Design a protein around this nucleic acid. Structure first.
Ligand SMILES: [Mg+2]
Lengths: 555, 407
DNA sequence: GTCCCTGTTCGGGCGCC
DNA sequence: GGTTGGCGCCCGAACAGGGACTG
């Protein structure tokens, strides 16, 4: 029908008029196909034919859809959307299977011709004018405007989700113990009822829907585990993803790689152990998406690892709010992490990875901090509370670090888990200077003009180096001097630098940086038995940061 | 309750468009309960997408309570609402409220609803309540009455406010009251106990209309300090020359010239240095300068208040307020004995903010020593106010970590 | 102010709906 | 095979800071 519901007022952004766009040419096979569509639609009040007093027009093409060789209308409102008001989008997120509680009876049903069952505000209606092209220049094509929610207009999704809500509210009031998941025109409906009476409640929903102009076709999964919902198969006591198939390709373009990372990420929600960090590195290349990136054999390792995991049967279970939430994290490679959320051992509500590089420099205890933050916010969305954690890090290490780190950092309730590898700090800086060890006063110095710099040191035992760097900078020469000193010191060293920047990076105890130099500095650091790093005011003539500075400033 | 007063967004700005963040079941159950009622009453109306604007909401139990308090983070809208929290606002800041013995913090926002909001301004007040696991789309609301948390609210309910206390005020020429937004700050020098029961007696000069502890003159300033030692080392002197160097921008007279020449050439770090005559009598003097206040630093109510914080560790956080960098209106420590790093630091910004309101009558913008992601995952779990200070996140040098060190 | 360097945000591809 | 909205993962491009410079 047309839903008896009230239109939602719509305006164009102030000062702008409608679209005046030229209907571009289309095959006669579409032009007939569109006339067929635009005739039944006209038959059913969804579109009104308009005269020459509608100034506006926007382009309407057509394309065959999904193995039917049936054409499907489609307007390009890209301009109307530009001129349409802003909206506040109401769809905030996507329902996840694991926030689903086990109900005794389940139904899934979709709403038919949903957008076309909702009235468009009449005063806005005229801006939707489109003309279906006569096979050429020949005829002024048929003019039409839209009476319902057009496909492809900026506003239609929202206004429909909104209307959907506002239509379901009455039923929801009356059936507070019927749970209805509402995604666009998709409905999951669940109850703790015997099918018979459950089934009644459903028809009772479909009658309510029908009274509002919303047809509930029969793509209704009735008494039909597996239900197919939001991408998943739902069985009565377990859920799963509908089958994933990674493109087995010969010559990967970059965008082919983004398509591969995509399926892996989606798989990563129920297949524990999915690794993607190696493949989301091949991407680090300001790019033509067309460009063909050669498969790194390290990625090669990864993909192989994954393609293998994918052959495994996995499933999740559903949420019991009686019980607690429990997350287990796993350090599973260089800044690749994995977790599972459960309420009983080996029964996985879901899983997931973290593998983000936040910072140019980071370490394990940061990342395992980041990944716990991620899992917190995710859990709030799906279950509306935060899980208990079980982490592969010993209280020891945490406190060593919550101590040396100078920006507040935190993790909740968490039990140690000896699921090795354990998260360790790879080296530690001394807190006080190392008695009797060699003391390197380092500095470096660049030349903003020639980009030429010097880095070097001067030491208490009497030795000094100066080294010249082409195409460098002050912060790299600072970092050079500290690596130079590291290279040349025994197993225990003291380093005095005037660089607030160098001090900053290293005091944070990196074990991983996008910078090869900071990585060269890290490999050394891991090799010493003790390192003390002291700072001093540059150019203030401290002994002997002034000699290092005097030798090093030939830049 | 009748007809209303015209408002406008600062000449050129557009309404708020901020996303709603995920909320816990409890904060949501609380919220639809609260908003169901304000719907029945007609303080909030239900709206849809046609309203392009949004502001975040969560809810807090203001303390150990079952009563949940709705908090709409109007931070943005307030920032965008026309200049009249200074321009049409009449309030001078009674300089002496900070001088009182006791001050009590009074929540009174639920008294703002009495007053209609301009018909054309309602839309900016829009906010969206989430559903958990996204079982439904967001449910959208708008305001028809002065909103709690909005800065235009007390700047309107003021004439009335100035009235509501005409008696109680006259009848108490030595108890001072101040209205900063949702909260009402009233305190007197009276004894510990007859103060409590004099505030309680304002609830009645209130309740007939409708509808925690904190002692001000004891937030003691925290000094900048130098380690005294019987024996010094190269490393000890180099840290000393490092601090005083810096401090020498906050205090003009601080000299380090005699100490820097004990570092004559390339000594090893742990070598001991015999402090010389002028040496010891330069830092002896320097430690005198650090006693005296900063001279010539004055609050500009026009300008922006800036708090800045450092984690010292051991539950001790040091802070400065300041408007021109280095001219700190105040400096302090939030000492906690012996531990949630994030609860700690969120509480630190509430204690400070209050002081700011109490002393200057506005709130700082904070520069926080925490990573955005981290602050944002957890901070609403420990918030307790009705105002929210602006903030931004900082990546501090470990040096300033080291310029407020005690021992 | 100019360099850097770091941290954000913002689009844009992909995934899924 | 030319259209819309959502969330997620990535990347880089744009920014905003902060420190260090400069004659
Ligand atoms: Mg230097």
């Amino acid at each position: 029908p047309i839903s008896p519901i009230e239109t939602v007022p719509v305006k164009l952004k102030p000062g702008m008029d409608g679209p005046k766009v030229k209907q571009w040419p289309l095959t006669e096979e579409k032009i007939k196909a569109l006339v067929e569509i635009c005739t039944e639609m006209e038959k059913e009040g969804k579109i009104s034919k308009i005269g020459p007093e509608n100034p506006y027009n926007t382009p309407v093409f057509a394309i065959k859809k999904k193995d039917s060789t049936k054409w499907r209308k489609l307007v390009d409102f890209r301009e109307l959307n530009k001129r349409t008001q802003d909206f506040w989008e109401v769809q905030l997120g996507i329902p996840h299977p694991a926030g689903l509680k086990k109900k005794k009876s389940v139904t899934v049903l979709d709403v038919g011709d949903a957008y076309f069952s909702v009235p468009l505000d009449e005063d806005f209606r005229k801006y939707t004018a489109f003309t279906i092209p006569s096979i050429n220049n020949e005829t002024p094509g048929i003019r039409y405007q839209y009476n319902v929610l057009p496909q492809g207009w900026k506003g239609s999704p929202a206004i429909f989700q909104s209307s959907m809500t506002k239509i379901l509210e009455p039923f929801r009031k009356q059936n507070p113990d019927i749970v209805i998941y509402q995604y666009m025109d998709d409905l999951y409906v669940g109850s703790d009822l015997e099918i018979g009476q459950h089934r009644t409640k459903i028809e009772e929903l479909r009658q309510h829907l029908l009274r509002w102009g919303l047809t509930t076709p029969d793509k209704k999964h009735q008494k039909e585990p597996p239900f197919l919902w939001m991408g998943y198969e739902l069985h009565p006591d377990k859920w799963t993803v509908q089958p994933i198939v990674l493109p087995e390709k010969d010559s990967w373009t970059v965008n082919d790689i983004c398509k591969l990372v995509g399926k892996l990420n989606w798989a990563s929600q129920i297949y524990p152990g999915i690794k993607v960090r190696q493949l989301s590195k091949l991407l680090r290349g300001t790019k033509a998406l067309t460009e063909v990136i050669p498969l790194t054999e390290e990625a090669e390792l990864e993909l192989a690892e994954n393609r293998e995991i994918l052959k495994e049967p996995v499933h999740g279970v559903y949420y019991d709010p009686s019980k607690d939430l429990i997350a287990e994290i796993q350090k599973q490679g260089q800044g690749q992490w994995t977790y599972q959320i459960y309420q009983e051992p080996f029964k996985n509500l879901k899983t997931g990875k973290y593998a983000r590089m936040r910072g140019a420099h980071t370490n394990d205890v940061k990342q395992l901090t980041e990944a716990v933050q991620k899992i917190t916010t995710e859990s709030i969305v799906i279950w509306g509370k935060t899980p208990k954690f079980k982490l592969p890090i010993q209280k020891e290490t945490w406190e060593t670090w919550w101590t040396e780190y100078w920006q507040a950092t935190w993790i909740p309730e968490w039990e140690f888990v000896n699921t090795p590898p354990l998260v360790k700090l790879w080296y530690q800086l001394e807190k006080e200077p190392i008695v009797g060890a060699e003391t390197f006063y380092v500095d470096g110095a660049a030349n903003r003009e020639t980009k030429l710099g010097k880095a070097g040191y001067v030491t208490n035992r009497g030795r000094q180096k100066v080294v010249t760097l082409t195409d460098t900078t002050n912060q790299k020469t600072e970092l050079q001097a500290i690596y130079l000193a590291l290279q040349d010191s025994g197993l225990e060293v003291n380093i005095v630098t005037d660089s607030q920047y160098a001090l900053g990076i290293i005091q944070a105890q990196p074990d991983q940086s996008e910078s090869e130099l900071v990585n060269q500095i890290i490999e050394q650091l891991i090799k010493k038995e003790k390192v003390y790093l002291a700072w001093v005011p540059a150019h203030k003539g401290i002994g002997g940061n002034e000699q290092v500075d005097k030798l090093v400033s030939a830049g | 309750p009748i007809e209303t007063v015209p408002v406008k967004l600062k000449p050129g700005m557009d309404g708020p468009k901020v996303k709603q963040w995920p909320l816990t079941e409890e904060k949501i159950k609380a919220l639809v309960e609260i908003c169901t009622e304000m719907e029945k009453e007609g303080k909030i109306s239900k709206i849809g997408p046609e309203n392009p604007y949004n502001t975040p909401v969560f809810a807090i139990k203001k303390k150990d309570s079952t009563k949940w308090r709705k908090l709409v983070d109007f931070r943005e809208l307030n920032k965008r609402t026309q200049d009249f929290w200074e321009v049409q606002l009449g309030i001078p800041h009674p300089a002496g409220l900070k001088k009182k013995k006791s001050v009590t913090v009074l929540d009174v926002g639920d008294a703002y609803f009495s007053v209609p909001l301009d018909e054309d301004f309602r839309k900016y007040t829009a906010f969206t309540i989430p559903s958990i696991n996204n079982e439904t789309p967001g449910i959208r609301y708008q305001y028809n009455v002065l909103p709690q948390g909005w800065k235009g609210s007390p700047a309107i309910f003021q004439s009335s406010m100035t009235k509501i206390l005409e008696p109680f005020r006259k009848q108490n020429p030595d108890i001072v009251i101040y209205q900063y937004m949702d909260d009402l700050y009233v305190g007197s020098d009276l004894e510990i106990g007859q103060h409590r029961t004099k505030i309680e007696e304002l609830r009645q000069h209130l309740l007939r209309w409708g509808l925690y502890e904190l002692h001000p003159d004891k937030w003691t300033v925290q000094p900048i300090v130098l380690p005294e030692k019987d024996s010094w080392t190269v490393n000890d002197i180099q840290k000393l020359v490092g601090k005083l160097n810096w401090a020498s921008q906050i205090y003009p007279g601080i000299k380090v010239r005699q100490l820097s020449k004990l570092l004559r050439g390339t000594k090893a770090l742990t070598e001991v240095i015999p402090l010389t005559e002028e040496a010891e009598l330069e830092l002896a003097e320097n430690r005198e300068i650090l006693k005296e206040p900063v001279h010539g630093v004055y609050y500009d109510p026009s300008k922006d208040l800036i708090a800045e914080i450092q984690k010292q560790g051991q539950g001790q956080w040091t802070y400065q307020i300041y408007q021109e960098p280095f001219k700190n209106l105040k400096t302090g420590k939030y000492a906690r004995m012996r531990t949630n790093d994030v609860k700690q630091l969120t509480e630190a910004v509430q204690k400070i903010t209050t002081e700011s309101i109490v002393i200057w009558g506005k709130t700082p913008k904070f520069k926080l020593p925490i990573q955005k992601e981290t602050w944002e995952t957890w901070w609403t779990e420990y918030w307790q106010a009705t105002w929210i200070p602006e903030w931004e996140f900082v990546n501090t040098p470990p040096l300033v970590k080291l310029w407020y060190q005690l021992e």
